[PDB]
Amino acid sequence: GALTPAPAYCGAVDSATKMMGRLADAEKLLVPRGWPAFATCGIVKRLLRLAATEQQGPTPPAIAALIRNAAV
Amino acid sequence: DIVWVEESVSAITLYAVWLPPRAREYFHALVYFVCRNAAGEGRARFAEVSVTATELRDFYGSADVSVQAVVAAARAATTPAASPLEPLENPTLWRALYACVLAALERQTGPVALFAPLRIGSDPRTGLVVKVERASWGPPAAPRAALLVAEANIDIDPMALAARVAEHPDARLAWARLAAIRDTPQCASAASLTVNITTGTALFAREYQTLAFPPIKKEGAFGDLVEVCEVGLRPRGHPQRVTARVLLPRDYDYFVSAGEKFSAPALVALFRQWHTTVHAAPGALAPVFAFLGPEFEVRGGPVPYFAVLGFPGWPTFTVPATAESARDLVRGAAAAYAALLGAWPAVGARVVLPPRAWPGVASAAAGCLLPAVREAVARWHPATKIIQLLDPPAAVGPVWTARFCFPGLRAQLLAALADLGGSGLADPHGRTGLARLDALVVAAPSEPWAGAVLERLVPDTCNACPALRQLLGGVMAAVCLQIEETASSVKFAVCGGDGGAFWGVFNVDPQDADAASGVIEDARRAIETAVGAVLRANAVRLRHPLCLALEGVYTHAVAWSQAGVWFWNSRDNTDHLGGFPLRGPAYTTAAGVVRDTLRRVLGLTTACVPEEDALTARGLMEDACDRLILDAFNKRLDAEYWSVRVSPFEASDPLPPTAFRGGALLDAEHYWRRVVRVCPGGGESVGVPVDLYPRPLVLPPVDCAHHLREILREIELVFTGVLAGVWGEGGKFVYPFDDKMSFLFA
């Protein structure tokens, strides 16, 4: 259900400068439970890694911190 | 005209350690006896001892320690509000201190024994125990217990932990926390600590937001558990009447705490608050606030424990998990307490003998032996194995193989050699610690609690006295020599082993089983009798009569390394694998895969040219690797399953600066660090300490392209051993993981 026409969009759309900050803010809620800190290529690599991370059971996925929905 | 009573001592704790006037090199120590008479009624008692400097330096093993240092440590431990966690400075100091005070208690006052009948006296003019004697009348009351749960959120600043871990790198994180409380005791004043001690009479529960502040939730009372007792005493050290407050444990006897999430800081904080509350009012002496455990040392320790060296005087036993057999481990902890006087596992190897009296006993035991073993001891170099065995690349079968073991041979031999050096000891009464080891060895087959004690008391004793290793391994070398000599007579053939455990083959026809049992039993009889005869000739006498265990009969056996052996009895399909490291939850699945692949590959005894069998074996081994990596994918997200237990000795991944934020989770780390290698971003593989983060965990995908490589490495070691051991050599089984099935994860 990611490439199935949906009435509205749901995701993280921002310029490189803003998404850089939002990625760090998401990591601030992601670091407490395991994600290592990453102290326009770094941003794309980090976003791809977030998107690739898979769902462990019914728990909301890792990208849900950035996209801000449990249906992701 | 001395008073006389009938009681059983339930605990022995340290109240005061003082240096009397006109004294330079001997300190007095007051001991609190928690005595209970028949039907459980408890009266508190006290005794005094006098430890000299020489005894301290003997139980320490070095002369660095002094009487002034011990008295200063005791004075610092007098007040827990000013400075708790005193043992953390020099843990060996307090270890030796408890050892010597118990030894002097045994010597001067007499024989003591926890949870056992004991006739006790006292001198009213002074008011202390004068002499303890073993009694022989009374069905003593059962050692009742109380279940304790305590959890505290001690807000320790992470950066302090990071700095203290930077000063000493491989510092177990519980030691880091504990040092943080020690350097800032005010942190133990503010914590959301919750305590629930359930007993058989009345329950007691308290809850705090700040520890000093009054409870935000009460239940029962402090008085239901404790009977605060004010006792007057006139020690030889203190001419003036000195009053002591003690917390007599009515209703219960010892504590039972779950070792699953046990926090030594939590109990330390709770007991510090109790100490402050009870000894707030003056006009009386203050006790010693000392506790020991594996969390109190930089490198940690194997067995969880929580020593109670002083306040409150109640032993507390941590029983880790083991829910199915919780009563069994509670009884084991109680027995370990009662037998070794509660020193174990806190005092260490000093329960038996002072660490420095051992250099004498070992020398005194090298003399009473036979002339041959006298040299055999002196020519022992680490891992000599002077016995005809198999080349490590080799395999045998189908021939009737059998594994044998002497249950507890190192412990029994140590006991016999300790008795050989017993005459060489300075004090005949100083051989009571040599009676606990015989009690352990005698009761080892009857009850397993003595076992785990002996599998740690003995290797640690061998580290206390390096010279004892060359004695024990020489006596065991002599045992192996007679094993080999007797083996030829009963058709047995030494093929491998490690001393007490040895596996071999039989020169009987490999098809008959009715007479196989007879030869396998006669070999056991003859080897046991011959080894016992050599030990008797070597003067070494064992308390429990020697017994050989038939640990399995097998038809095929294959060995690759010095410890790796796989045995398989085709008739009943019973197998045994050793030498494969179980360093995690995935290694167990790997071991099962190996033990099935080997069962299928030695089932290829169908008549074929050896060359054909090598290929139809390598194909099956590659297929087993395939089925293992395929199943690995279905558990790629279970980071705990792909976890490795790193020891505090092995090279370890560097701790992420956010693992120092686990709160009441850093305390669980005592020995092992469970690490999983995850792959954030790309290219870089970083280690995550699994048990230092709250659950459920969120992580980047686990780098199975690292763990599976090591698991496969050891699988190829085993498979190269079997391939080059049954059929023709020359084949190193390698699985092309990087090409065939690397894509699944990377």
Which two three-digit tokens encode residue B233?
């005493």
Q: What's the rounded Cα separation, in Å, for the pair B155 and B269?
A: 12
Long-range contact pairs involving B176-179 (C-beta distance under 8 Å, separation at least 24): B176/B660, B176/B666, B177/B265, B177/B295, B177/B666, B177/B667, B178/B85, B178/B88, B178/B264, B178/B265, B178/B268, B178/B295, B178/B296, B179/B88
Q: Which of B681, B693, B698 sits opposite A62 (nearest CB)?
A: B698
B694 → chain A, closest CA residue: A33
Which residues are within 8 A (CB) of B606 and not within 5 positions of it... i.e. 6 or more apart? Answer: none
Q: Which of B637, B657, B694 sits opposite A54 (nearest CB)?
A: B637
A59 → chain B, closest CA residue: B696
**What count of residues does chain B have?**
746
Which two three-digit tokens encode residue B29?
């120590």
Which residues are within 8 A (CB) of B285 and not within 5 positions of it... i.e. 6 or more apart? Answer: B15, B16, B242, B243, B244, B245
- Give yes or no for a contact between A31 and A37, defined as CB atoms under 8 angstroms apart: yes
Give the dihedral of Cα atoms B452, B453, B459, B460; nearest 10 deg: 140
Q: What's the rounded Cα separation, in Å, for the pair B208 and B273?
A: 11
- Give yes or no for a contact between B348 and B289, defined as CB atoms under 8 angstroms apart: no
Long-range contact pairs involving B319-323 (C-beta distance under 8 Å, separation at least 24): B319/B256, B319/B257, B319/B258, B319/B259, B320/B258, B320/B259, B320/B260, B320/B262, B321/B258, B321/B259, B321/B260
Give the dihedral of Cα atoms B224, B225, B230, B235; nearest 10 deg: 170
Q: What's the rounded Cα separation, in Å, for the pair B287 and B77?
A: 8
Q: What's the rounded Cα separation, in Å, for the pair B690 and B669?
A: 11
- Give yes or no for a contact between B423 and B413, defined as CB atoms under 8 angstroms apart: no
- Give me the residues of B, 673-712, that contact A with CB < 8 A: 678, 680-682, 686, 688, 693-694, 696-701
SS3 assignment for B130-194: EEEEECCCCCCCCCCEEEEEEECCCCCCHHHHHHHHHHCCCCCHHHHHHHHHHHCHHHHHCCCCE
Listed residue (B8, B12, B7, B29) closest to B337, CA to CA: B12
Q: What's the rounded Cα separation, in Å, for the pair B528 and B268?
A: 50
Listed residue (B528, B549, B538, B526) closest to B475, CA to CA: B538
Listed residue (A72, A20, A9) closest to A44, CA to CA: A20
Give the dihedral of Cα atoms B48, B52, B58, B59; nearest 10 deg: 20
Cα angle B318-B286-B241, degrees, rounded to a multiple of 5 = 135
Alpha helix (H) ranges present in chain A?
Answer: 16-28, 41-52, 64-67
SS3 assignment for B359-427: HHHHHHHCCCCCHHHHHHHHCCCCCCCCCCCCCCCEEECCCCEEEEECCCHHHHHHHHHHHHCCCCCCC
Which two three-digit tokens encode residue B219?
């239940």
> Solving technique for this entry?
cryo-EM
**What count of residues does chain A have?**
72
Q: What's the rounded Cα separation, in Å, for the pair B504 and B498?
A: 12
Q: What's the rounded Cα separation, in Å, for the pair B11 and B247?
A: 12
Distance between first and last Cα of chain A: 9
Which residues are within 8 A (CB) of B261 and not within 5 positions of it... i.e. 6 or more apart? Answer: B151, B664, B665, B667, B668
Q: Name the region of B209 (left: φ>0; alpha: ψ -120 to 50; beta: rest).
A: alpha
Q: What's the rounded Cα separation, in Å, for the pair B377 and B468?
A: 10
- In chain B, which residues have their Cβ closer than 8 Å to the Cβ of A45? 681-682
* A68 Cβ under 8 Å from any chain B Cβ: no
DSSP conformation class of B312: B
Cα angle B219-B224-B225, degrees, rounded to a multiple of 5 = 100
- Give yes or no for a contact between B43 and B249, defined as CB atoms under 8 angstroms apart: no
DSSP conformation class of B482: H
Q: Which of A49, A56, A59 sits opposite B700 (nearest CB)?
A: A49
Question: Which residue reads 């009573």 in tokens?
Answer: B5
Listed residue (B710, B657, B667) closest to B688, CA to CA: B657
Amino acid at B484: E
B506 beta partners: B492
Amino acid at B277: T
Which two three-digit tokens encode residue B607?
């008549």
Greatest alpha-carbon span in chain B: 95
Amino acid at B4: W
Peptide bond into A5 cis (omega under 30): no
Which two three-digit tokens encode residue B48?
């005094």
Q: Which of A30, A45, A46 sits opposite B698 (nearest CB)?
A: A30
Q: Report the residue numbers after which chain A has a gap, meaning the C atom sits over 2.5 angstroms from the next written residue's N, or none.
A: 39
Number of Cβ within a 10 Å radius of residue B536: 12
Give the closest-approach CA distance of A12 to chain B in angstroms: 19
Q: Say whether B34 sits in a helix, a strand or coil.
A: strand
DSSP conformation class of B105: I
CB contact under 8 A, B697 and A33: yes
Q: What's the rounded Cα separation, in Å, for the pair B21 and B402?
A: 68
- In chain A, which residues have their Cβ closer than 8 Å to the Cβ of B661? 32
Q: Write out the H or E segment, with its range, that includes residue B704.
A: helix B704-726
Listed residue (B438, B409, B254) closest to B340, CA to CA: B438
Q: What's the rounded Cα separation, in Å, for the pair B238 and B425?
A: 33
Q: Which of A34, A37, A49 sits opposite B688 (nearest CB)?
A: A34
Question: Which residue reads 């705090």 in tokens?
Answer: B208
- Give yes or no for a contact between B623 and B599, defined as CB atoms under 8 angstroms apart: no
Q: Report the residue numbers after which chain B has a gap, meaning the C atom sits over 2.5 angstroms from the next written residue's N, or none.
A: none
Residue B727: phi, psi to the nearest 5?
-100, -175
For β-strands B254-258 and B145-151, DSSP reports them as parallel
Which two three-digit tokens encode residue A3?
């490439």
- Give yes or no for a contact between B677 and B710, defined as CB atoms under 8 angstroms apart: no
Q: What's the rounded Cα separation, in Å, for the pair B188 and B147?
A: 23
- Give yes or no for a contact between B579 and B595, defined as CB atoms under 8 angstroms apart: no
Task: Please tell me what resolution, in angstroms, this structure has.
Answer: 3.7
* B657 Cβ under 8 Å from any chain A Cβ: yes
CB contact under 8 A, A33 and B694: yes
Cα angle B350-B354-B355, degrees, rounded to a multiple of 5 = 85
Listed residue (B549, B552, B597) closest to B575, CA to CA: B552
Burial letters for B64-97: b for 16+ Cβ neighbours within 10 Å, e otherwise?
Answer: ebebeebeebbbebbbbbeebbbbbebbbbbbbb
Q: What's the rounded Cα separation, in Å, for the pair B267 and B181?
A: 13
* Ordered DSSP codes for B558-586: EE-SSS-EEEEETTTTEEEEES----SHH
- In chain B, which residues have their Cβ closer than 8 Å to the Cβ of A53? 700-701
